[PDB]
Write a protein that binds this ligand. Structure first.
Ligand SMILES: Cc1cc2nc3c(=O)[nH]c(=O)nc-3n(C[C@H](O)[C@H](O)[C@H](O)COP(=O)(O)O)c2cc1C
Length: 147
């Protein structure tokens, strides 16, 4: 099986989290392709992948805004090949904000409309993800067991 991880990260937190998940999946036997959202195009992005994991941090002055590099992908999600695709989401944030990891919710909701199959509720990391390593590894393991 092939898994794609696409992340939008500005300060490196969601990127670390994506790398952590990627190693877990690889150790299990998946062929993993991990890509920064800045480097991808939406159109047919998910083609060929058995599992897609999308990660993004949350921004915005007084609204929920997705990480800049992820925005174009979210805006064109309908062209990615999400129907019937097994997906799960993750993100980093900071619980000082009420809309903690709000990006994750926005992405999940769109995916559901698009007919994707959300295999596990999104992983939401507060603060330094290295401090949450066990939680990330545990979530990767739960995603695997949910396929
Ligand atoms: C202006 C600003 C707005 C933010 N808004 C949110 C927010 O609504 N929800 C949240 O959970 N975190 C918010 N954050 C926290 C970032 O998402 C958090 O620093 C995160 O670790 C960045 O992840 P990244 O390094 O992968 O981009 C905000 C941070 C800044 C500076």
């Amino acid at each position: 099986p092939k898994a794609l991880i696409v992340y939008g990260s500005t300060t490196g937190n969601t990127e670390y989290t994506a790398e952590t998940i990627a190693r877990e999946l690889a150790d299990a036997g998946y062929e993993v392709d991990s890509r920064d959202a800045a480097s991808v195009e939406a159109g047919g992005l998910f083609e060929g992948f058995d599992l897609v994991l999308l990660g993004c941090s949350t921004w915005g002055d007084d609204s929920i805004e997705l990480q800049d590099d992820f925005i174009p992908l979210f805006d064109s999600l309908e062209e990615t090949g999400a129907q019937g695709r097994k997906v799960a989401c993750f993100g980093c944030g900071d619980s000082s904000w009420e809309y903690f990891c709000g990006a994750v919710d926005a992405i999940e909701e769109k995916l559901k409309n698009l007919g994707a199959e959300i295999v596990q509720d999104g992983l939401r990391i507060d603060g330094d993800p290295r401090a949450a390593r066990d939680d990330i590894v545990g979530w990767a393991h739960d995603v695997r067991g949910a396929i």
